Design a protein around this ligand. Structure first.
Ligand SMILES: C[C@@H]1O[C@@H](O[C@@H]2[C@@H](O)[C@@H](O)[C@@H](CO)O[C@H]2O)[C@@H](O)[C@H](O)[C@@H]1O
Lengths: 306, 306
């Protein structure tokens, strides 16, 4: 079965690490960071990895029941699954599918319905994924809210993410840290079942990222968010399940107005892209440009320089 | 070129009328209302209709610049396109792409950034789509917020939707009205360029709806939300652009565990589904079930009762 990537343009696609559109293609050096995101991870033959699931809108959402921490505006959420069943911590995954894969303060809204009468409520909420109480793999996360008495126990509650925050009285853009994984089971625990770190291995190459800007809700957050694969590529490979004929799919990025190739890149079968470039660079592309799979090559193929 | 629908299950797909997952399938008689949604509208050969666009996360999202209404907590948003290009009110669409297609009060968050130093601001906001100031076709909508002084003008501002509210009456579940389109031009003009109203037209048939429950943020809202096509079907048809060989595609809903067909349905070329059933019915389906296109059929095809 022939392998393909979708014909959607970059701007027609969605970040796989937060529920926002893609904006641009970006390449840069990894530096002293290890790049190991857990959302937006899928092999080219359609095996989901890490915490990756298929829904573009369920990324960084949470569902469950909540309990008030007395005297505070904090609430503890006992996690349910995406369809309100019990969360199974025995599954060999790092954390529930769709769990945030970076350390930062994600602001959004906690909503709840009382099942007996259909009454509803909603409050500003922030989840700090570097917090000691961020333990999604154990089935519990804590939210800071703007209420101390308007959430009920034993009622379905959902967190919808909006954006990120930063304490402006502290060093600007010091958080989020997009390449720092949470400790999914809390302090002094060790993450397990992670999708692997990715890095270029060939001279002159860098990762190519699909970049968005997360909305900021307060302060001076670092809003950059790089994913390794658009969410639509995850969905496409999962359905197509085309076998990989080598370890590297050569893609050409084409301007359809001219038919001319802008650049070429390697889509590694384990689900990430490299390009021949060094340094930080926002790629200049026509907005109707698209990726086209052209041929299977090896790890020693030399790309045309970006 | 062979037509296909995605192999994703119901719970693996997304509502095309609000950025939330699908939950279930529902059928019922629909002479009580006009079924004319404008999001989630697409022909089987990939022509987008109404206000439909491709992004699951831009449904009920607004982008533009905001201006404060003095002496109130209200802000007017002068709308941009979803990629920040100008919105052209003379384009032959009913309203900006992704505009909500029901009368109701949608709560979310308005966010913006100052590029000069990266400061960010976020505030609770509600848009009442039945209000006289809901005039997206003219290029503006009005938000009720929790602030009077904390938004810059002339600055890109985003509304992220979260859920719906009910207020202004002791009566329960009388809003949203999911089958009542807003007046996209307000009182200045009637709605134009609408995707067609849909109805069963074969004896014994009813529409099949792809149903979610919208988050409720206050009061006693009617949270049911039915779409005619999953958002992933819209994206699939857009890319595949497979020609329709008749006006009616026969789909079978298959349990891949057993291989057995649970029911069959008609996917009409103009982009909606019917089943042979009389009465309101919540379909009971295996969670791994999915739709499979089997053949193009003529106008005289009698579906097996579901
Ligand atoms: C039904 C209740 O709704 C919310 O509270 C309401 C407020 O949001 C506001 O609409 C006003 C209306 O006068 O008062 C409240 O009724 C929830 O916060 C509350 O928990 C109930 O579910």
């Amino acid at each position: 079965k022939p392998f393909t990537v979708p014909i959607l343009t970059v701007e027609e696609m969605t970040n796989s690490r937060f529920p926002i559109p893609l904006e641009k293609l970006f390449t840069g050096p990894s530096g002293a960071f290890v790049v190991q995101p857990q959302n937006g991870r899928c092999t080219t033959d359609g095996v989901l990895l890490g915490t990756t699931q298929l829904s573009p809108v369920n990324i960084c959402t949470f569902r469950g029941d909540v309990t008030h921490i007395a005297g505070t505006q904090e609430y503890t959420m006992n996690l349910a699954s995406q369809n309100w069943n019990n969360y199974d911590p025995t599954e060999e995954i790092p954390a529930p599918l769709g769990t945030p894969d970076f350390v930062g303060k994600i602001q959004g809204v906690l909503t709840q319905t009382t099942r007996g009468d259909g009454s509803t409520r909603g409050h500003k909420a922030t989840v700090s994924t570097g917090s000691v109480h961020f333990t999604p793999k154990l089935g519990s996360v804590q939210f800071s809210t703007d209420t101390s008495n308007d959430f009920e126990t034993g009622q379905n509650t959902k967190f919808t993410p909006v954006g990120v925050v930063q304490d402006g009285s502290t060093t600007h853009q010091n958080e989020p840290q997009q390449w720092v994984l949470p400790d999914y089971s809390g302090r002094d625990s060790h993450n397990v079942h992670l999708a692997p770190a990715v890095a270029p291995t060939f001279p002159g190459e860098q990762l190519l990222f699909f970049r968005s800007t997360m909305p900021g809700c307060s302060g001076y957050p670092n809003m950059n968010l790089d994913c390794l694969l658009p969410q639509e590529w995850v969905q496409h490979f999962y359905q197509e399940a085309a076998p990989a004929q080598s370890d590297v799919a050569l893609l050409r990025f084409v301007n359809p107005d001219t038919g001319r190739v802008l650049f070429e890149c390697k889509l590694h079968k384990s689900g990430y892209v490299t390009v021949a470039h060094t340094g930080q660079h926002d790629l200049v592309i026509p907005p109707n440009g698209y990726f086209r799979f052209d041929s299977w090559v090896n790890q020693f193929y030399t790309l045309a320089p970006m």
